[PDB]
Amino acid sequence: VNAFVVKHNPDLRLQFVAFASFIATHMAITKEFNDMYQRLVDITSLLELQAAQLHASEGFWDSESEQQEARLQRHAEHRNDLETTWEEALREATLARNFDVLVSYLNHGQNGIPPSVTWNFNAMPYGKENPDTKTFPIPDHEQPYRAFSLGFTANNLSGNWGDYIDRQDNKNALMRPARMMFTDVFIPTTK
Amino acid sequence: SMDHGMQYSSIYWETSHRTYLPFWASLTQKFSWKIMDDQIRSFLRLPKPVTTEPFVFSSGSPYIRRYFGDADISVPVPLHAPAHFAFVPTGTVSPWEETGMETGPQGA
Amino acid sequence: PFMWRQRAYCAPVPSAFASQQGVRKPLLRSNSESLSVFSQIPDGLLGHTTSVTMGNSDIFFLPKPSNLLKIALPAFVFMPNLTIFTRAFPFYAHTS
């Protein structure tokens, strides 16, 4: 191998050129494969987004306040349509003096019905200590471990950061005002 | 008034917390063997998965796969227009009416 | 199947009450499908995501200048010597 390489690249600059070209070719082919897999992953992510958009059409991401307000809005629109139609029908039937006219205004406006009940995301319970998630205890050999970091310089045991949803401040109340002092870097807010 | 929001919380790195990234990490890049494995399976005529077949034998009712540009990405879709049934009589219930107030057997 | 107006999780979505929409999407769906992951999303790349591996980054190199030093240094004992007094090891290991 060394013979075949030095035969074709006897000098250091040529050896370096060949090495760099090898690296570039490797990187390019790796980029091709990664681009293909990235296209697949992009498609899967887009289908996840489509699922989440579907949930929003059904009001799954809405809150109960928003659901009630939409319900009231439909109710009010329907009520107003009905009473306006009643006023028109009564006026026309009064000027005509005929009950069949009122009867005929019963079918001037029926796709389906409004939903009887609704379910949302905020009704699903969450909590490490919340007993709304606990049916039976999960055995210890199936529960996951918290990360461990311990050295002279830093640790992760003087505080608790929480879960992905229910987060909390790692530092305690007396040193929260001096959080800037427990950092190698600090990027403050914009205001 | 939700898009293009301002920075509300601070961003920081605690002292001596590790980073796990070397100096060539920007030149590092990922890789999966799945494309090469697919090419090799196709070329060597190895056992295919059943996701290449649109028909679905995994249930009694007929299902057909809908593919998103690739045999690796599919969802089964049922074909039957299912008939539903109700062993219920019509017109026997008026839930809007309060029945505890009306006098009768239905009310009791 | 017993308390329909009180169990909304097992109920159809509001798109089902609307009576209006090769293969079509199904007309009836429950909210209980929210308790499943791969109900609506596909199972593509399900078992191939734990196979995308990345190597570590640690380099085990440190120059060892002994010309700077002229004294010995202490050293830990890591394991007990079993090549000597092997037969008695369970009997004297607890002493000091």
Binding site: - | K30, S32 | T49, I59, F60, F61
Partner: peptide, 21 residues
């Protein structure tokens, strides 16, 4: 020898999975 052993130990013996988006 140290670079070779680190390379082998890292890219053959200490591979771990990573997420893809």
């Amino acid at each position: 020898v140290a670079l070779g052993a680190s390379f082998v130990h890292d890219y053959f013996y200490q591979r771990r999975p990573v997420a893809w988006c």
